[PDB]
Design a protein around this ligand. Structure first.
Ligand SMILES: COC(C)(C)C/C=C/C(C)=C/C=C/C(C)=C/C=C/C(C)=C/C=C/C=C(C)/C=C/C=C(C)/C=C/C=C(C)/C=C/CC(C)(C)OC
Ligand SMILES: COC(C)(C)C/C=C/C(C)=C/C=C/C(C)=C/C=C/C(C)=C/C=C/C=C(C)/C=C/C=C(C)/C=C/C=C(C)/C=C/CC(C)(C)OC
Ligand SMILES: COC(C)(C)C/C=C/C(C)=C/C=C/C(C)=C/C=C/C(C)=C/C=C/C=C(C)/C=C/C=C(C)/C=C/C=C(C)/C=C/CC(C)(C)OC
Ligand SMILES: COC(C)(C)C/C=C/C(C)=C/C=C/C(C)=C/C=C/C(C)=C/C=C/C=C(C)/C=C/C=C(C)/C=C/C=C(C)/C=C/CC(C)(C)OC
Ligand SMILES: COC(C)(C)C/C=C/C(C)=C/C=C/C(C)=C/C=C/C(C)=C/C=C/C=C(C)/C=C/C=C(C)/C=C/C=C(C)/C=C/CC(C)(C)OC
Ligand SMILES: COC(C)(C)C/C=C/C(C)=C/C=C/C(C)=C/C=C/C(C)=C/C=C/C=C(C)/C=C/C=C(C)/C=C/C=C(C)/C=C/CC(C)(C)OC
Ligand SMILES: COC(C)(C)C/C=C/C(C)=C/C=C/C(C)=C/C=C/C(C)=C/C=C/C=C(C)/C=C/C=C(C)/C=C/C=C(C)/C=C/CC(C)(C)OC
Ligand SMILES: COC(C)(C)C/C=C/C(C)=C/C=C/C(C)=C/C=C/C(C)=C/C=C/C=C(C)/C=C/C=C(C)/C=C/C=C(C)/C=C/CC(C)(C)OC
Ligand SMILES: COC(C)(C)C/C=C/C(C)=C/C=C/C(C)=C/C=C/C(C)=C/C=C/C=C(C)/C=C/C=C(C)/C=C/C=C(C)/C=C/CC(C)(C)OC
Ligand SMILES: COC(C)(C)C/C=C/C(C)=C/C=C/C(C)=C/C=C/C(C)=C/C=C/C=C(C)/C=C/C=C(C)/C=C/C=C(C)/C=C/CC(C)(C)OC
Ligand SMILES: COC(C)(C)C\C=C/C(C)=C/C=C/C(C)=C/C=C/C(C)=C/C=C/C=C(C)/C=C/C=C(C)/C=C/C=C(C)/C=C/CC(C)(C)OC
Ligand SMILES: COC(C)(C)C\C=C/C(C)=C/C=C/C(C)=C/C=C/C(C)=C/C=C/C=C(C)/C=C/C=C(C)/C=C/C=C(C)/C=C/CC(C)(C)OC
Ligand SMILES: COC(C)(C)C\C=C/C(C)=C/C=C/C(C)=C/C=C/C(C)=C/C=C/C=C(C)/C=C/C=C(C)/C=C/C=C(C)/C=C/CC(C)(C)OC
Ligand SMILES: COC(C)(C)C\C=C/C(C)=C/C=C/C(C)=C/C=C/C(C)=C/C=C/C=C(C)/C=C/C=C(C)/C=C/C=C(C)/C=C/CC(C)(C)OC
Ligand SMILES: [Ca+2]
Ligand SMILES: [Ca+2]
Ligand SMILES: [Ca+2]
Ligand SMILES: [Ca+2]
Ligand SMILES: [Ca+2]
Ligand SMILES: [Ca+2]
Ligand SMILES: [Ca+2]
Ligand SMILES: [Ca+2]
Ligand SMILES: [Ca+2]
Ligand SMILES: [Ca+2]
Ligand SMILES: [Ca+2]
Ligand SMILES: [Ca+2]
Ligand SMILES: [Ca+2]
Ligand SMILES: [Ca+2]
Lengths: 53, 42, 53, 53, 42, 53, 42, 53, 42, 53, 42, 53, 42, 53, 42, 42, 53, 42, 53, 42, 53, 42, 53, 53, 53, 42, 42, 42
């Protein structure tokens, strides 16, 4: 929609920016936790490259 | 209107918002291409 | 109904938009958690493609 | 009753709409949970179609 | 009256409400027919 | 009693309607839980029609 | 009246309330007849 | 007592009606719970008529 | 008096209250007779 | 005492009626529960008349 | 006095209260006689 | 003491009546509970008269 | 005095209070005699 | 002390009476509980006079 | 004074208080003599 | 009306809302077609 | 000190009588509990005089 | 001073307080002499 | 210091007296508990003089 | 000063306080001498 | 976007600075903790360089 | 605008903010290069 | 410093006195507890002088 | 940046100083705890220099 | 910095003194706890000088 | 200054405070010498 | 400005702040060099 | 300024503060030297 810019006349741009940044940060943290909770995608505990400890 | 912004203000904020969102999406797409090259999940 | 636009004269568009966005985000998170809690649809632990760890 | 429209002079249409939407969403979520909690109707764990994991 | 709505307002809201509820019930009926074809429970 | 309509001069019709709707919904949910908690009337886990899982 | 309704309003609400209650009772009865034909409990 | 109608000059008829309805509903629910908690009067688990599950 | 009702109001409420209570008691009595015929407890 | 009626000039008749009704209901419920908690006076689980279940 | 009731009001309320209490006690006595006949506890 | 009636000029007769009735009810309930908690004075679980159950 | 009661009111209340307490004590004494005949505890 | 009556010019007679009555009641209840908690002075559970149950 | 009582009021209250306390102590002394006769503890 | 919006405002918001919802539903439909091709669940 | 009476110009005589009475009662209760918790000084369970139960 | 008592009031209260405390300590002494005769602890 | 009396121009004599009395009482109670918590200095459980129970 | 006491008031309170504390300390010294005679701890 | 500086006309620079500093500190602490919770990247317990203890 | 800052103030803060962020990012990049030389994770 | 007396122009002497006394009392209690928790310095449970119990 | 001093026109120097001091103290305590929780860097329990106990 | 004395124009000298004293006391207590929790530096349980208990 | 004390007041309080500190420290030192003689810890 | 500080005073606080931070960092660097000499961790 | 102190007041407080801190640090240094002579930890 060409008039999608009018949404900022309805929802506060500053509150939306704060909420978007906070949600994206929480989402990234959650995804990294989910990946680290798995065995196939825990890049820290994987053994690659070959271990030292 | 409801937020107190002018129509020109809303238009310019929308432009900058979409540009920043496009840049963020491009960075995320590069990151996901790198992740797929590193270890595909599907 | 052709007069479905009249619903915005009753429920505030801003609160409706905020609630819709929040509910859709929560629903997506819940569906992804439900799929990951299964064995057939946990795309991270399914072993496809073939594991490295 | 032909005069069933008069109920909106008694109960607030906006509050009724919000309550109806929330209750229907909660009811759908609850029914999907009940179906997933069973074995015969958990469409994600039923093994159908044939499993890959 | 007590809700502040006019009688005409209440009538038109009731009409739109029943139309939307009928559409929702029809979609739900189609979904339930599909579910019964997929896996009957009785 | 022919004058049973006079009860709406005492108890608020809107409050009574909302209480009746809420109580009936809760009662139906409770009955469905009670039936699903039984083996004889859990229509989901009964085995009828013959199972696929 | 402690509710603010008039006598005519109370009567006309009672008529619609009783009719809607009767329709609800008739649907519950058919549902119960279907449930008894499906799986009698007594 | 022929003057038992005067009790409504003392206790509020609407409050008494609300309390009586609530108490009767709770009492019926409690009695049905007590009956279902027993083996002889649990009409759902009694095996009559003959079971299908 | 204490409730704000008139004496005539109290008498008519008492009449309708006892009529409704008698109807409820009759329904309860029929239900209990059916329950006794179904499964006596004593 | 012939002037036992004067007690209602001291304690509010409506409050006394409410308290008496509530206390009598609670006492009756308590007695029925105490009888049900015993074996000799649980008329529901006594075996009399002869069981079906 | 302290409760705002008149002496005549207190007397008549006391009469109705004692009549209702006597009726309730009589019903209770009949119930307890029936219970003793059903299953004596002493 | 012949002047013991003067105590009602000090402690409120309505409050004392309420407290006395409540305390006596609680005391009676407590004594009945203590007797039921014993074996020798639980008249319900005693075996007297001879049991049916 | 400090309860708002007159001296005559206090005397009258004391008389009725002591009469009611004596009646309650007599009923309690009869009940305890019955309980001692039923099952002495000492 | 002959002037021990002057203590009522210092501590409120009504509050003192209420506190004394409450404390004496609690003390009697506590002593009876302590006696009932012992084998030698539980007059209910003692066996005297000779038991029936 | 501090309680608002008069010196005569305090004196007469003290007299009645001590008389009632003496009566209570005499009943408790009789009860304890009976308890010692029933089952001495020392 | 009760939200402060005019009829034209409500109409244009409804148009944009439905257009955005349709675009979201189209993206969701493409995602579900991809998920069915990847791993069907029924 | 001969001027020890001046302490009542400092600490309120009524608050001290209440504290003193309460503290002495609590102290007596605590001492009797301590003695009863011992074996040598539990005069109720000591065996003296010779038991009946 | 800060309690509202006069010097004479304080000195008479002190006299009565000490007399009562001395009487209390005398009963406690007899009680402890009796307890030592009954069962010495040291 | 000869001018140690000046401390009462800073700390309230009444509050100091109350705190001192309370602290001394608590300290005495605590010390008696500590002595009773040991075996060597529990004068009640020591067996001295020779026990009767 | 800060407590509202006069210098003479503070001096006399200090004197009485020191005397009472000395008496308390003397009783505690005998209590401790008696305890050491009863059962030394060091 | 060349007009990205306009974001400071919407979100308060001091609040953003405080939030950014706090979030970065928490993020660094969390990353260091995650690394220490592993075996391959716990630089303190890895055994390199060779241990003394 | 809504933060109370002037456009020139916003531009200067943005410049200093981005300079500080670039310096922090460069330090972080050096630290991550050192961490990859020390112990690569991928 | 010769002008160390000026600290009382900054911190309230009465509050400092209260805090110092409370802290010193707490510290002494804590040290005595620490010593009693040990075996080497619990002078009460040490065995010295020779025990009676 | 040459104009980094302007940050103190935005964040209050006193609050920044207090927060920095508190955070640095907490960070130092945390690092010392982390080192003491390991075996290789617990300088108190490492056994160097050679133990006496 | 020669102008380090100016820090007392921002942070309250009395508050800083109170906080510093409290923090130093807590730090000393914590260090003593840490030392006593170890075997090497528990001067109370180390057995030096030679034990008597 | 900010405590309401005068310079002379602060000086004399400091003198008395340090004298009391010295007395307390001397008592503590004597106690610790006695503790070291009784049972040295180092 | 926003904190109430003058430009000269922010530049003064900043100089002293950076000097103190540099001194603290130098002490920390010496401590870390000593720690590395004592027991290297990498 | 922010604390209400004068520049001379701040200077004198800083001098006394650093003197007291130096004395405390010297006492701490002596204590740590004694601790090292007692039981070295490194
Ligand atoms: C005149 O001016 C104005 C502005 C007012 C004009 C505008 C008017 C407009 C635009 C009106 C719009 C109206 C709309 C959009 C109305 C929509 C109505 C809908 C969608 C209604 C739908 C209703 C559905 C209902 C009430 C369903 C109820 C279902 C129940 C109660 C189910 C109960 C189930 C139970 C108890 C148990 C089930 C089984 C278990 C327990 C297992 O489930 C978990
Ligand atoms: C111009 O003025 C106005 C605006 C006022 C005019 C407008 C008037 C209008 C439009 C009126 C509209 C009225 C309507 C729509 C009324 C609808 C009424 C309905 C649907 C009533 C339904 C009632 C049902 C009831 C009360 C059911 C009660 C059931 C009970 C109490 C069951 C109890 C069961 C128990 C305690 C235990 C059972 C066993 C369990 C469940 C425990 O299982 C073992
Ligand atoms: C003049 O203008 C106006 C507007 C005022 C005129 C209008 C007047 C109107 C319209 C009046 C309407 C009145 C109505 C509708 C009255 C309805 C009254 C009813 C239905 C009364 C029902 C009463 C039922 C009672 C009190 C039941 C009591 C049951 C008891 C106390 C049960 C106790 C059970 C016990 C203690 C234990 C049971 C054992 C268990 C089962 C719990 O365990 C084994
Ligand atoms: C003048 O104007 C006006 C408007 C005021 C005129 C109107 C006047 C009117 C209409 C008056 C109406 C009065 C009414 C309706 C009065 C009703 C009175 C009733 C029903 C009284 C009933 C009383 C029952 C009593 C007090 C029962 C007491 C039972 C007790 C205390 C039981 C205790 C049990 C114990 C302690 C232990 C039991 C052992 C268990 C079973 C718990 O364990 C083994
Ligand atoms: C006139 O002036 C102004 C300023 C107002 C003009 C401006 C107007 C503008 C710019 C308007 C903009 C509007 C926009 C952006 C609208 C966007 C609308 C969207 C995206 C709507 C989307 C709707 C989606 C819906 C309603 C989805 C519903 C999904 C449901 C209810 C799912 C239920 C699922 C259930 C019950 C169960 C699932 C299974 C589980 C997960 C439980 O288990 C497997
Ligand atoms: C002038 O106008 C007026 C109206 C004021 C005139 C009237 C004046 C009147 C009438 C005055 C009346 C005064 C009265 C009645 C005074 C009564 C005073 C009494 C009875 C004082 C009693 C004092 C008792 C004391 C202080 C006891 C203290 C005991 C202590 C501190 C015990 C401590 C125990 C410890 C620390 C440890 C025990 C060992 C444990 C139990 C812990 O382990 C075995
Ligand atoms: C001019 O007008 C007026 C009214 C103002 C004149 C009047 C002035 C007057 C009368 C002034 C009176 C002043 C007085 C009486 C002052 C008394 C002061 C005293 C006795 C001070 C004592 C101070 C002691 C201190 C501060 C001790 C500190 C000890 C510390 C911080 C210990 C810390 C230990 C730690 C952290 C850990 C240790 C090891 C543990 C215990 C944990 O065990 C392993
Ligand atoms: C001029 O006008 C007026 C009205 C003001 C004149 C009137 C003046 C009057 C009448 C004044 C009266 C004053 C009085 C009665 C004063 C009484 C003072 C007393 C009795 C003071 C007693 C003080 C005792 C003290 C402070 C004891 C302190 C003991 C301590 C701190 C012990 C500490 C122990 C520790 C830390 C550890 C022990 C070992 C543990 C128990 C922890 O483990 C075994
Ligand atoms: C004109 O007048 C005035 C006074 C206004 C002029 C003055 C202006 C001044 C002095 C301005 C000063 C500005 C300054 C000092 C700015 C400093 C800016 C800085 C340092 C910015 C730094 C930003 C860094 C960011 C935003 C980093 C973000 C990182 C993110 C979001 C990382 C997310 C990671 C996730 C979600 C998951 C990662 C993996 C985990 C950690 C979970 O582990 C597996
Ligand atoms: C104009 O008038 C006035 C009055 C204003 C003039 C006066 C001005 C004055 C006197 C100014 C004085 C200023 C002062 C004294 C400033 C002092 C500043 C200092 C000491 C600054 C120090 C800063 C240190 C920083 C920012 C350190 C940051 C460290 C960080 C963020 C570490 C992070 C570590 C992480 C995330 C993880 C570590 C891993 C662990 C160890 C936790 O786990 C493995
Ligand atoms: C005219 O005057 C003024 C001052 C107004 C002019 C100034 C205007 C300016 C300067 C504007 C600046 C605007 C800016 C900087 C805008 C930036 C916008 C950005 C970066 C937007 C980014 C958006 C990203 C989105 C919306 C991402 C959404 C992701 C979602 C919803 C993901 C959901 C995932 C779910 C629910 C499910 C699966 C994920 C899990 C983790 C569960 O899978 C396992
Ligand atoms: C002049 O105008 C007016 C209106 C004032 C005139 C009207 C006056 C009127 C109408 C007055 C009416 C007065 C009435 C009705 C008075 C009724 C009084 C009654 C019934 C009094 C009854 C008293 C009973 C008492 C105080 C019983 C006490 C029992 C006690 C304290 C038991 C304690 C037991 C203990 C602590 C220990 C052992 C028990 C356990 C269970 C623990 O043993 C194992
Ligand atoms: C002039 O106008 C007016 C209105 C004021 C005139 C009216 C005056 C009137 C009418 C006055 C009436 C006064 C009355 C009725 C007074 C009654 C007073 C009574 C009965 C007093 C009774 C007192 C009893 C006492 C003080 C008992 C105390 C017992 C104690 C403290 C026991 C403690 C035990 C302990 C701490 C330790 C061992 C017990 C345990 C249970 C622990 O052993 C195992
Ligand atoms: C002009 O008019 C007036 C009235 C203002 C003049 C008067 C001025 C006066 C009288 C001024 C008086 C000033 C005074 C008395 C100042 C006293 C200053 C003192 C004693 C300063 C002491 C400072 C000590 C410091 C800052 C110690 C810091 C220690 C730290 C931060 C330790 C941290 C440790 C960490 C985080 C990590 C490791 C430790 C652990 C325990 C974790 O290792 C295992
Ligand atoms: Ca890796
Ligand atoms: Ca996969
Ligand atoms: Ca499936
Ligand atoms: Ca089925
Ligand atoms: Ca059945
Ligand atoms: Ca039965
Ligand atoms: Ca029996
Ligand atoms: Ca017995
Ligand atoms: Ca004994
Ligand atoms: Ca002993
Ligand atoms: Ca390492
Ligand atoms: Ca010892
Ligand atoms: Ca070491
Ligand atoms: Ca040692």
């Amino acid at each position: 929609s060409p008039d999608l810019w009018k949404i900022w006349l309805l929802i506060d741009p500053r509150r939306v920016l704060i909420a978007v940044f906070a949600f994206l940060t929480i989402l990234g943290l959650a995804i990294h936790m989910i990946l680290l909770s798995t065995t196939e995608f825990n890049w820290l505990e994987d053994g690659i490259p070959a271990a030292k400890v | 209107s409801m937020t107190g912004l002018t129509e020109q203000e809303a238009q310019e904020f929308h432009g900058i918002f979409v540009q920043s969102m496009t840049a963020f999406f491009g960075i995320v797409v590069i990151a996901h291409i790198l992740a797929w090259l590193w270890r595909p999940w599907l």
